[PDB]
From TrEMBL, chain A:
It comes from Homo sapiens. The cytoplasmic dynein complex 2 is probably composed by a heavy chain DYNC2H1 homodimer and a number of DYNC2LI1 light intermediate chains. It is found in: Cell membrane; Cytoplasm, Cytoskeleton, Cilium axoneme. It comes from the Eukaryota. Belongs to the dynein heavy chain family. The chain holds residues 852 to 924 of 4307 of the full protein. This is Cytoplasmic dynein 2 heavy chain 1.
From TrEMBL, chain D:
It is found in: Cell membrane; Cytoplasm, Cytoskeleton, Cilium axoneme. The lineage of its organism: Eukaryota, Metazoa, Chordata, Craniata, Vertebrata. This is Cytoplasmic dynein 2 heavy chain 1. It comes from the Eukaryota. Belongs to the dynein heavy chain family. It comes from Homo sapiens (Human). The chain holds residues 948 to 1020 of 4307 of the full protein. The cytoplasmic dynein complex 2 is probably composed by a heavy chain DYNC2H1 homodimer and a number of DYNC2LI1 light intermediate chains.
Length: 96, 86, 310, 96, 52, 86, 86, 86
C-alpha cells in the first residue's frame, strides 16, 4: 500500500507540460490558482518521510523525497521559461 | 550429470538426442575416447553419417560443421562437442 | 490544475499491461512428492529439495532478449493435508484472482494414498477461489463475470458445452511426478491409473503431461499457465491410444474416448483400490515445570491481550 | 561494416554487365577494413575490465563477438571468393 | 554445400582476483611500577593548580 | 614444446608441416581455440579444405578422416589432432 | 565470531555455507592450515572438487578462479579466501 | 630476503627460478597483492598457466597441486606459496 502511495501522492511520470502552459495559462486569475497549488505541493513533498518502519522491514524513502522535491521545483522553472517566451513572441508577431 | 548447452546450431530433436546420448555414454564409459565413440556412433545410425565427437575436461577446437548439425554442451564438468561434417 | 489532471491521467491509464503486472502460481501437491525438485529445476536453481512445506515462497526471473525487463514470477506451494485452508487462504485474494492460476502435481509413488490426498487439497483450494470472487463484497463484479465466462468456454473448444460437469473457475495444468515407478505397476493398474488421471483432466479442463528429460512440454506448459513464461500453448496430440506416455490437450478429452461422470468414476475407483503424547504426564519435576508453567502462561496471555486484528 | 560489406560482396563475383561498376566498391572495402577491423581487438582490450566490474554481465558483448566471428570469416571468405571469381571471370569473359 | 566454421573453448573464462588483508596498527608504550605520578608516556596552561 | 608424433596416416612432408605449424601456433597463441584456429587455417590454404584441428590437454575423440590426411601428436604436454574430412 | 563478507562471486547458498563451514572450522581448530583443510575438504564433497582455501591475518594473494565460485570474508579478525580452480 | 625452502615438489631449476623471481618481486613491489601478482604472471608466461601465488606473513593453506609444481619457502619473514593447479 505505501509503495503505491509514494507513486500516487506525487506522480512520477510527469509528462511534459510546456505545450499545456503555453497554450492555456498565464492569465492573471487562472495562473494564481495554478501557481498557488504548485507552491502547496512543494510544502507537501517537504514532508515526505525519509523512511517507513514496520514490524520487520525498514524502507529508505529519502531518495524519493529528493526526486519528488526536484520535480515540483522543475514545474516552476518551466513556467518561468514559458512566460518569458510568450511575451517575447506576441509583439513580434503583431509587429509583422 | 547436469546438462548445460552453451552453443547449438541444431534442431530441438537432435539437441535432445545429443544430451541423452552423451548422458548414456558418460554413465556407461569412463575413458573419453570410448565416451566419444558411443555418442558418434549413435548419431551416425539415427541421423546418418558423418558425425564426429570429442569429449573431455580440457580442450579447444576449431572445426567446420554442416549447418544445423552443431552442439557444444557440458554434463557436469565434462564438455562434449558433437557435430556433423561429411 | 489541468497540469496535475494530465499527469494523473497518464500514470493511472498506463501501468497494468519493464514488464507488465506479473502473475503468480500455487502448486497443489503432496508432501515429499518430488514437486520441489521439479519447481527448483523449472526456476533454474541448484537447490536440494525440501520434503516438507509450510506455505513456502520462491520466485524466479526471466529476460526477453531486447533488454532485461526483469520478468519476475512469484510461486507458492504446500504439500499434504496440512493446515490447508489456514495457509491456502492467505496468498489468494479475489482482487488478484485474475493473475492467479493453479498447478497440480501427482506423485506416482502411491496412487492409492494420492487420490484421497489430492481430492481433499483440490476441494479446499477450489472452494476458496470460488468464493473470493465475491466474498470481498466486490460490487463491481464485471471482472467476476469475465473470469467465469472466459475459463468455462476455453476447454469446450469444439465439444458442445452441454454442462459444467464441475464448475472450476481457475486455470489448471496437471503433471505427474517420479514416473520412473509407474512402469513397475501391474499393467491393469497402469491402465486404471491412466484413466483416473485423464478423468480428472476432463473435470478440471486441465491438460496432462508426462515427466522426463526430452519431454520439454512439462516446463513449457507450466510457463504457459505461468503467464507464458516459457512459451505458448503449443498444442500437441493426445496419447490416449499409446497409453505408454501420458498427455492430454484439454478439450479433446471427451469421456467417450478417454474412458471408453459417476459411472466412469465408479469403475476405476472401485477397481483399483477400495480400502482407501506431549502431555508428559507420567513424569515429575518441581522447579523446571513450575517455572516453565509460569513463563508459558505469562507470555501467551500477553500476546493474546495485544488484541491483534490478524 | 562487415555485415553491409558481405551483402554487396555477395553480388560481386558474378560476371553481369548490370554491375560493371561494382569492382570499385570491391577495392574500397579492401582499403577500408584495415581501419575498421581493429575495433574488435579494442573492444576486447577494454572488455578485460568490463568483465570484472560488470560481474560478467556481458551477454550483449559475447553475442556480438560471435556474430562478428561469422561475418569476418564469412565476409573474408566472400572477399577472397569475389576477388578470385572476378579475376577468374574477367579472364574467362574477356577471352569469350 | 552449406557448411559453417565454429570453435569451442572449454576454459570459457578465467577470472583473476587480487586479495590484500589490512594492516595492524601498533604503538610503543612505556610502563614502570616504581616511579613518578605519570608512569609512562608515548615516545603550559597549568589550569590544573587552580581548583586547589 | 618438444614434438613427438604418436600416430599418423599422412605423408612425411605434411607431417613435418603439421609439427612446425602447430609449434608456431603454440608459440604465438595462449588459448587452445586460437592455436587450433591458426593450425586449421594454414592447412586450408596450403593443402585445400576441409581441415579440422583440436588442441588440448585432456580429451578423447572418435572421428572419421580422409586417408593420408591424419596426424596426432604432442607438443610438450598438449595434444594436437589434425585431419581432413569434408 | 561475526562473519563479514567483503567480496564474493558465488551463489547465496554457497556463501552462507562457506561461512558456516569456516565457522565450524574455527571453533574446531586453532592452526590456520587445519582450519583451511576443514573448509576445503567440506566444499570438495558438497560442491565437487577442486577447491582451495587460505586462512590468515596477514597476506596478499593473486589467484584465478572459476566463475561463481569465489568468496573472501572475515570471521572476527581472521580472513578466509575460498575458491574453485581445477 | 634470505631464502629457506620448506617444501617443494618441483625441479631444481624451477626452484631456483622461483626464489630469484620472488626475491626480485619483493625488491620491486611493496604490497603483497602486487608481489603475488608479479610472481604468478611470470610463471604463467614461462611455465604455462594456471599458477597461483600467496605472499604473506601470517597464513595457512590447504591446496591441491599438479605433481612437480609446488613450492613453499620464506624470504626472511615473508612466506611465498607458489603452485600450479588448473
Amino acid at each position: 500500500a505505501v509503495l503505491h502511495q509514494h507513486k500516487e501522492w506525487i506522480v512520477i511520470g510527469q509528462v511534459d507540460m510546456e505545450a499545456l502552459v503555453e497554450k492555456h495559462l498565464f492569465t492573471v486569475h487562472d495562473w494564481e490558482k495554478n501557481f498557488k497549488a504548485l507552491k502547496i505541493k512543494g510544502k507537501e513533498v517537504e514532508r515526505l518521510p525519509s523512511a517507513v518502519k514496520v514490524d520487520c522491514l525498514n524502507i529508505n524513502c529519502n531518495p524519493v523525497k529528493t526526486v519528488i522535491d526536484d520535480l515540483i521545483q522543475k514545474x516552476x522553472x518551466x513556467x518561468x521559461x514559458x512566460x518569458x517566451x510568450x511575451x517575447x513572441x506576441x509583439x513580434x508577431x503583431x509587429x509583422x | 550429470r547436469k546438462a548445460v548447452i552453451k552453443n547449438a546450431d541444431m534442431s530441438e530433436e537432435m539437441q535432445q538426442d545429443s544430451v541423452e546420448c552423451a548422458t548414456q555414454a558418460l554413465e556407461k564409459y569412463n575413458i573419453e575416447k570410448d565416451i566419444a565413440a558411443h555418442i558418434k556412433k549413435e548419431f551416425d545410425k539415427k541421423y546418418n553419417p558423418t558425425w564426429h565427437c570429442i569429449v573431455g575436461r580440457n580442450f579447444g577446437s576449431y572445426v567446420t560443421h554442416e549447418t544445423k548439425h552443431f552442439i557444444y554442451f557440458y554434463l557436469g564438468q565434462v564438455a562434449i562437442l558433437l557435430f556433423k561434417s561429411g | 490544475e489541468t497540469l496535475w489532471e494530465i499527469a494523473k491521467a497518464e500514470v493511472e491509464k498506463r501501468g497494468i499491461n519493464a514488464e507488465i503486472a506479473e502473475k503468480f502460481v500455487f502448486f497443489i501437491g503432496s508432501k515429499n512428492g518430488g514437486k520441489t525438485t521439479i519447481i527448483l529445476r523449472c526456476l533454474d536453481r541448484d537447490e536440494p529439495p525440501k520434503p516438507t512445506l509450510a506455505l513456502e515462497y520462491t520466485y524466479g526471473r526471466r529476460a526477453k532478449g531486447h533488454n532485461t525487463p526483469k520478468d519476475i514470477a512469484h510461486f507458492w506451494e504446500l504439500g499434504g493435508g496440512t493446515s490447508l485452508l489456514d495457509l491456502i487462504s492467505i496468498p489468494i485474494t479475489g482482487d488478484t484472482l485474475r493473475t492467479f492460476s493453479l498447478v497440480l502435481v501427482l506423485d506416482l509413488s502411491k496412487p492409492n494414498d494420492l487420490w484421497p490426498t489430492m481430492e481433499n487439497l483440490l476441494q479446499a483450494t477450489k472452494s476458496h477461489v470460488d468464493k473470493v470472487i465475491m466474498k470481498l463484497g466486490k460490487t463491481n463484479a464485471k471482472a467476476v463475470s469475465e473470469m467465469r465466462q472466459k475459463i468455462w468456454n476455453n476447454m469446450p473448444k469444439d465439444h458442445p458445452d452441454h454442462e459444467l460437469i464441475d464448475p472450476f473457475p481457475v486455470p489448471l495444468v496437471i503433471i505427474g511426478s517420479k514416473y520412473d515407478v509407474f512402469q513397475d505397476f501391474e499393467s491393469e493398474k497402469r491402465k486404471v491409473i491412466c484413466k483416473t488421471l485423464r478423468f480428472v483432466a476432463h473435470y478440471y479442463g486441465a491438460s496432462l503431461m508426462f515427466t522426463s528429460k526430452s519431454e520439454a512440454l512439462l516446463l513449457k506448459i507450466r510457463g504457459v499457465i505461468n503467464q507464458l513464461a516459457f512459451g505458448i500453448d503449443k498444442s500437441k496430440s493426445i496419447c490416449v491410444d499409446q497409453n505408454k506416455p501420458l498427455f492430454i490437450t484439454a478439450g479433446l478429452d471427451s469421456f467417450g474416448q478417454i474412458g471408453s461422470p459417476m459411472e466412469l468414476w465408479k469403475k476405476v475407483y472401485e477397481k483399483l483400490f477400495p480400502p482407501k503424547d506431549p502431555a508428559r504426564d507420567p513424569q515429575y519435576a518441581e522447579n523446571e515445570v513450575d517455572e516453565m508453567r509460569i513463563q508459558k502462561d505469562l507470555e501467551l496471555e500477553q500476546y493474546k491481550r495485544s488484541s491483534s486484528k490478524s | 561494416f562487415v555485415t553491409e560489406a558481405m551483402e554487396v560482396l555477395t553480388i560481386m563475383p558474378q560476371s553481369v554487365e548490370e554491375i560493371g561498376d561494382a569492382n570499385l566498391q570491391y577495392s574500397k572495402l579492401q582499403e577500408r577494413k584495415p581501419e575498421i577491423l581493429p575495433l574488435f581487438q579494442e573492444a576486447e582490450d577494454k572488455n578485460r575490465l568490463l568483465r570484472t566490474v560488470a560481474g560478467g554481465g556481458l551477454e550483449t558483448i559475447s553475442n556480438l563477438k560471435a556474430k562478428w566471428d561469422k561475418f569476418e570469416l564469412x565476409x573474408x571468405x566472400x572477399x577472397x571468393x569475389x576477388x578470385x571469381x572476378x579475376x577468374x571471370x574477367x579472364x574467362x569473359x574477356x577471352x569469350x | 554445400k552449406n557448411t559453417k566454421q565454429a570453435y569451442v573453448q572449454c576454459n570459457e573464462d578465467n577470472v583473476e582476483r587480487d586479495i590484500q588483508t589490512e594492516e595492524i596498527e601498533t604503538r610503543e608504550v612505556w610502563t614502570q611500577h616504581p616511579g613518578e605520578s605519570t608512569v609512562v608516556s608515548g615516545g603550559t596552561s597549568d589550569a590544573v593548580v587552580m581548583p586547589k
